[PDB]
Amino acid sequence: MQHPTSTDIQRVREFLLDLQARICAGLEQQEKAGGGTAEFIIDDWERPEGGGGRSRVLQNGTVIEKGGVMFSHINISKLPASATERHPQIAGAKAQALGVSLVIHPKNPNIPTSHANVRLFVAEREDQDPIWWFGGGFDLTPFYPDDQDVLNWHQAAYDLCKPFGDNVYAEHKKWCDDYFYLKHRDEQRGVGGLFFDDLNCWDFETCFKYIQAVGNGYLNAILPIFEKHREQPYTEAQREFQLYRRGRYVEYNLVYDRGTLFGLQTGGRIESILVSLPNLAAWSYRPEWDEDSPEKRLTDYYLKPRDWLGLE
Amino acid sequence: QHPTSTDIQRVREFLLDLQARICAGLEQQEKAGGGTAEFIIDDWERPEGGGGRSRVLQNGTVIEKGGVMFSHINISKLPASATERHPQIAGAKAQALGVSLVIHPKNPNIPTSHANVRLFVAEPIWWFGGGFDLTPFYPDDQDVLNWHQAAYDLCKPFGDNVYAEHKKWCDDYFYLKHRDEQRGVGGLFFDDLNCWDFETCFKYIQAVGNGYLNAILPIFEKHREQPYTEAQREFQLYRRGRYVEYNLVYDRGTLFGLQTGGRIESILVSLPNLAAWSYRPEWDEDSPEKRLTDYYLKPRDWLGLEE
């Protein structure tokens, strides 16, 4: 009945701020290992409705070309109709939300773009228990995919999900594939990972332990992929293909991503919302690649839903 | 009984010739600047009937990317608003024909620009749509005034209120709500145009389409050889990100085409070859970069008609 209490919210808040700090530190170690000096600069801000956030943004880097790791903890006054549809008892409640969202675009085409999010929503009414749920996930967006990295990414997700239930990875992996689909291109955005929302089916502390496992799991899975490819050479053609593929990432976020669109429509903090867009992206008319090329294999093989771990 | 099938064919011949003349005029600027890129023809057909001619210039010296796109097709899906504004079209055989273009110059001193002229017919219920608009990076006051004067002059024979209405409609439509910015310095925009007899409406889209070409070429000629810095190039790429945001978040034709299985590569030819995004850039208030948004990308009474 109690959970989440204000003490529970504070524990989640402290976890999220520390996770933001540790993700920035781990990625910054990669920037410095490649001879860079760019940092995830802190921009703290406040919302008049209440609360605020800490944005940490690295630009013009040597290894991380652009990255944002974004914390917020705010009062909520507008929700998408789906949330109120899926949870009708939040109507007329005081609500708050807290989370970390991140998108990292490496300079080297041999390291994928990646994204993660972990968040908690709580709606409180007089004489009613709080209504709450968590959401989050992580996902990998390659340009020159490496089979072993895709398997290790999915194995990391499978292993962190296992203690919560033998069905959790399968459900959240499928949800990630279903969500990150670019309908007008008939392509997946990437090679997937985990995605979930409306998570309140386990007791509160089990759900908080899950978002810890997902957030920490993103960091522990992404750093080895940086380390593997940081110094790997690439050609000007591969840079051009990366910029062309980044145009697909912009198309997903501006046409399909529910959080981005809701934020743009309701007067959210536009510069923090659109930190997910890469520093540079390209579009060209009707390019072609040869049948046996890695560029063609990216869309023919990797950007379709696949049973990477052979579970089925 | 207008438009007859003969009338549709007259409109089609006008549109194809307009596409040819726009590509030729812009190609002359490409060659004047030492370039060799051309608006390459891609002809295509659609099983439901009809098809189009796409003409696309890539990797140019003066035109960095440009598409001048003709289509004439049988239409089966229409946006909710079209059936709402014209409820009799429900259940009719329909067709649509038009030219749409977006031109992105290499030199930041030449604005991006856009134009469209089109006709819809349901068998008949018919209407035209179209307009043109200018998207600068380093605006030039005289060019903005000349662009608007060209629009004012071509509208005049159709009525003393036509420019005012289609200029306001352009400002209202090309607004980026989430940035609280106009897309550009405006021009003309109109849809559902069937309030004059058919031939007067056809003469209007001729004036609009020809007017785009006659107004854009002097702006290319004025600035083609004008030097620019690396910082101005970077600002142009950053500003092109706003163009992508408008077309993917607000442009009704783009969104409808993406949602309904249209020809995606033709639809998205409007996006520039390269665009940039950055977090919280700042420019001093005295700079041209800040004046672009503080002054030019707001609705303005350029010609003084409302004073």
Question: For every residue of chain A, which 3-state class applies, written as one string?
Answer: CCCCCHHHHHHHHHHHHHHHHHHHHHHHHHHHHCCCCCCCEEEEEECCCCEEEEEEEEECCCCEEEEEEEEEEEEECCCCHHHHHHCHHHCCCEEEEEEEEEEEEECCCCCCEEEEEEEEEEEECCCCCCEEEEEEEEEEECCCCCHHHHHHHHHHHHHHHHHHCCCHHHHHHHHHHHHCEEHHHCEECCCEEEEEEEECCCCHHHHHHHHHHHHHHHHHHHHHHHHHHCCCCCCHHHHHHHHHHHHHHHHHHHHCCHHHHHHHHCCCCHHHHHHHCCCEEECCCCCCCCCCCHHHHHHHHHCCCCCCCCCC
A288 CB within 8 Å of a chain B CB? no
Take residue B78 and report the two structure tokens written for it: 């229409």
Distance of CA B244 to the CA centre of its chain: 14
Query: Helix or strand or coil: residue B16?
Result: helix
Residue B188 in contact with residue B151, Cβ under 8 Å?
A: yes
**CB–CB contact A68 B279 (8 Å):** yes
CA distance B181 to chain A (A): 13
d(CA B199, CA B207): 12
Considering only the beta carbons, identify the residue of B54, B245, B279 that sits closest to A254: B245
Residue A194 makes CB contacts below 8 A (sequence gap 6+) with A136, A137, A138, A139, A157, A161, A169, A172, A173, A175, A176, A214
Q: Does B50 lie at the interface with A, CB-CB under 8 angstroms?
A: no
CB within 8 Å of A272: residues ≥ 6 apart: A53, A55, A68, A70, A72
Q: Regarding beta strands A41-46 and A51-59, do their DSSP bridges make them parallel or antiparallel, or are they unpaired? A: antiparallel
Q: Which of A43, A58, A255, A284 to mutate to test the interface with B (most CBs of B within 10 A)?
A: A284
- Residue B72 DSSP SS3: strand
Specify whether the CB–CB gap between A74 and A272 falls below 8 A. no
**Omega of the bond leading into A4 within 30 degrees of 0 (cis):** yes
Residue among B72, B137, B59 nearest B100 (CA): B72
- Interface contact A277-B42, CB threshold 8 A: no
Distance from CA of B137 to the nearest CA of A (A): 18
Interchain contact, B279 vs A283, CB within 8 Å: no
Q: Determine how many CB atoms are found less than 10 A away from the CB of residue A240.
A: 14
CA-based radius of gyration for chain A: 19
CB B73 within 8 A of CB B98: no
Inter-CA distances, A208 with A9, A116, A201, A221, Å: 10, 16, 12, 20
**Is residue B226 helix, strand or coil?**
coil
CB of B231 less than 8 A from some CB of A: no
- First-to-last alpha carbon distance for chain A, in angstroms, is 39
- Measured between CA atoms, the residue of chain B closest to residue A261 is B249
Two tokens, residue A145: 């995919």
Question: Alpha-carbon distance B185 to B298, whole Å?
Answer: 8
User: Contacts of residue B256 in chain A, CB cutoff 8 Å?
Assistant: none
Tokens, residue B73: 């097709």
Fill in the amino acid letter for B260.
Answer: T
> What is the edge-to-edge ordering of all strands in the sheet holding A94-106?
A41-46, A51-59, A64-76, A94-106, A113-124, A131-141, A192-199
Q: Do B278 and A251 touch (CB under 8 A)?
A: no
| CB of B38 less than 8 A from some CB of A | no
Let me know: does B22 contact B214? Beta carbons within 8 Å.
no
Residues 6+ apart with CB under 8 A from A154: A173, A192, A193, A308, A309
Q: Which of residues 131-190 of A touch B (CB under 8 A)?
A: 183-185
Q: Does B272 touch chain A (CB under 8 A)?
A: yes
Q: Nearest to residue A122, comparing CAs of A109, A134, A131, A110? A: A131
Give, as one character, the DSSP assignment of residue B175. Answer: E
CA-based nearest residue to A180, from A119, A241, A135, A139: A139
Rg (CA), chain B: 19
Q: Which two tokens stand for residue A189?
A: 């955005």
Active site residue B114: yes
Per the CB < 8 A criterion, the answer to whether A170 and A192 are in contact is: no
Task: Please tell me which residue of chain B has the smallest CA distance to A269.
Answer: B178
Question: Which residue, A71, A121, A72, A73, is CA-closest to A93?
Answer: A121
Beta carbons of A285 and B178 less than 8 Å apart: no
Report the DSSP beta bridge partners of residue A205: none
Q: Looking at the complex, report in whole angstroms how far the Cα of residue B262 sits from the nearest Cα belonging to chain A.
A: 9
Q: Is A270 on the interface with B (CB under 8 A)?
A: yes
Q: Please give the residue of chain A at the shortest CA–CA distance from B269.
A: A285
Cα–Cα distance for residue pair A68/A152, rounded to 1 Å: 24
Q: Which residues does B196 contact at the CB level (< 8 Å), separation at least 6?
A: B158, B204
Kindly state the tokens that stand for A83: 């949330």
For the record, the structure tokens of B117 come out as 């002229």
Helix (H, G, I), strand (E, B) or coil at B13: helix
User: Out of B72, B114, B166, B223, which one is annotated catalytic?
Assistant: B114
* Burial class (CB within 10 angstroms; exposed 0-12, middle 13-18, buried 19+) of A258: exposed
Tell me if A243 and B276 make a contact (CB, 8 A cut-off).
no
A73, A105, A115, A229: which one is catalytic?
Answer: A115
CB proximity B277 to A under 8 Å: yes
3-class secondary structure for A224-255?
HHHHHHCCCCCCHHHHHHHHHHHHHHHHHHHH
What span, in angstroms and rounded, lies between the C-alpha atoms of A144 and A242?
Answer: 9
The first and second tokens of residue A298, run together, are 């990216």
Residues B252, A97: Cα–Cα separation, whole Å:
32
Tallying the residues shown for chain B, one arrives at: 307
Please, which residues have CB within 8 angstroms of residue A8's CB and are 6 or more apart in sequence?
A2, A204, A208
Measured in degrees and rounded to the nearest 5, phi and psi for residue B144 equal -65, -45
Tally of structural domains, chain B: 1
Looking at the complex, does the CB of residue A243 fall below 8 Å from at least one CB of chain B? yes
Q: Residue B142: exposed, middle, or buried by beta-carbon count in 10 A (0-12, 13-18, 19+)?
A: exposed
Helix axes of B162-173 and B141-155: crossing angle, nearest 10 degrees: 130
Nearest to A222 by CA among A107, A103, A304, A118: A103
Looking at CA atoms only, how far is residue A152 from chain B in angstroms? 31
Tell me how long chain A is.
Answer: 312
| B30-37 contacts at long range (C-beta below 8 A, 24 or more positions apart) | B30/B57, B30/B60, B30/B61, B30/B62, B30/B63, B32/B62, B32/B221, B32/B224, B33/B61, B33/B62, B33/B224, B33/B225, B34/B61, B35/B60, B35/B61, B35/B62, B35/B63, B36/B61, B37/B61, B37/B63
d(CA B37, CA A33): 43
Q: Give the CATH number of the domain where residue A231 resides.
A: 3.40.1500.10
Q: Where are the beta strands (DSSP E) in chain B?
A: 40-45, 50-58, 63-75, 94-105, 112-122, 125-135, 175-176, 181-182, 186-193, 274-276
Where is chain B broken, named by the residue before each break, C–N > 2.5 Å? 123
Q: Is the minimum CB–CB distance between A275 and chain B shorter than 8 Å?
A: yes
Q: Which residues of A touch B179 (CB under 8 A)?
A: 270
Q: Of A185, A281, A285, which has the smallest distance from its Cβ to B56's Cβ?
A: A285
Domain containing residue B262: 1-307
B271 contacts in A (CB within 8 Å)?
247, 283
Asked if the C-beta of A274 comes within 8 angstroms of chain B's C-beta atoms, the answer is: yes
In this structure, the strands spanning B181-182 and B175-176 are antiparallel
Residue B123 touches partner A, C-beta closer than 8 Å: no
Residues B166 and B173: their CA atoms lie apart, in Å, by 10
Q: Please report, for residues B19, B150, B267, the alpha-carbon distance to residue B25 in angstroms, rounded to integers and kept in the order given.
A: 10, 18, 23
The whole-angstrom distance between A224's CA and the closest CA on chain B is 27
What whole-number distance in Å separates Cα of residue A286 and Cα of residue B54?
11
How many C-beta atoms surround the C-beta of residue A6 within 10 A? 11
Q: Please answer whether residues A179 and A135 qualify as being in contact, where contact means their C-beta atoms are separated by less than 8 angstroms.
A: no
**DSSP states along B75-130:** E----HHHHHHSGGGTT--EEEEEEEEEEEESSTTS-EEEEEEEEEEE--EEEEEE
Lookup: tokens for B53 = 């001619």
CB atoms within 10 A of CB B265: 17
Cβ contacts of A213-217, under 8 Å, gap ≥ 24: A213/A160, A213/A161, A213/A163, A213/A164, A214/A116, A214/A118, A214/A136, A214/A137, A214/A138, A214/A160, A215/A15, A215/A16, A215/A19, A215/A100, A215/A116, A215/A118, A215/A136, A216/A19, A216/A160, A217/A138, A217/A156, A217/A157, A217/A160
Write phi, then psi, for A148 (nearest 5 degrees): -65, -35
φ, ψ of residue B258 in degrees (nearest 5): -65, -35
Asked if residue A36 lies in contact with residue A62, where contact means CB atoms within 8 angstroms, the answer is yes
C-beta of residue A86 within 8 angstroms of C-beta of residue A64: no
Interface check for A284 against chain B (CB to CB < 8 A): the answer is yes
Tell me which residue in A55, A264, A285 faces B249 most closely, judged by beta carbons.
A264
